[PDB]
Design a protein around this ligand. Structure first.
Ligand SMILES: CCc1nc2ccc(OC)cc2nc1O[C@@H]1C[C@@H](C(=O)N[C@]2(C(=O)NS(=O)(=O)C3CC3)C[C@H]2CC)N(C(=O)[C@@H](NC(=O)OC(C)(C)C)C(C)(C)C)C1
Ligand SMILES: [Zn+2]
Length: 190
């Protein structure tokens, strides 16, 4: 089936919170047909397949997510399934054209290393950048807390996109750091 948008992380106000826009039955139906007529809003979408759920983030007019979540699948849209515009298994990255109604993040040009990871539960987690594709959690969390947030963004203090969350760096079940696709690699892929 297609990947289906089932909610979003609302970042528009003073408070970050998840919203569900489609339940599991409707999601299952929409995945089979590839036809999704629901209104899309925001920069960070919660998405699902038949078997998994994760995030997808709009940057530069593309809705980006991880290959390990989406594989080569289409995404459901008001006019039927939409094929990926980008697929890179080596970077664990896919992208589709961004849905009408979505808002896109701007790629960061700040050169700053104080970042913020947004999870599928609308937790905003500070992250110190530690390399091109790594950042440390200021406060370590069990894996559980981050599971299902691949595809979500790392943002700079100004709200620009710095990367897409890919993997957790763990020791005995605790995530001390994160691995992400840097926005420059998105821009190159482009
Ligand atoms: C580089 C990662 C990767 N690349 C892939 C490329 C292609 C591919 O093709 C099949 C598979 C890949 N798998 C991948 O990793 C897989 C997928 C990915 C994962 O689960 N991603 C998350 C997460 O939340 N995932 S998620 O729950 O949302 C899942 C629904 C998407 C964000 C994590 C939250 C806990 N993985 C790790 O994070 C592992 N850690 C990892 O390998 O650490 C390294 C890279 C530092 C060694 C865990 C599970 C031990 C924590 C293993
Ligand atoms: Zn920035």
């Amino acid at each position: 089936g297609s990947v289906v948008i089932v909610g979003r992380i609302n970042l528009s106000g003073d408070t970050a919170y998840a919203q569900q826009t489609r339940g599991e039955e409707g999601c299952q139906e929409t995945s089979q047909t590839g036809r999704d007529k629901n209104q899309v809003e925001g920069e960070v979408q919660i998405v699902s397949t038949a078997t998994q759920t994760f995030l997808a983030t709009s940057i530069n007019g593309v809705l980006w997510t991880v290959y390990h979540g989406a594989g080569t699948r289409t995404i459901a849209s008001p006019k039927g399934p939409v094929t990926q515009m980008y697929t890179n298994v080596d970077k664990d990255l896919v992208g589709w054209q961004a849905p009408q109604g979505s808002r896109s993040l701007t790629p960061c040009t700040c050169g700053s290393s104080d970042l913020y990871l947004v999870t599928r539960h609308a937790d905003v987690i500070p992250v110190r950048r530690r390399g091109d594709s790594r950042g440390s959690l200021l406060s370590p969390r069990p894996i559980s807390y981050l599971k299902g947030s691949a595809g979500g963004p790392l943002l700079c203090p100004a709200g620009h996109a710095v990367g897409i969350f890919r993997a957790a760096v763990c020791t005995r079940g605790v995530a001390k750091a994160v691995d992400f696709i840097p926005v420059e690699s998105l821009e190159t892929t482009m």
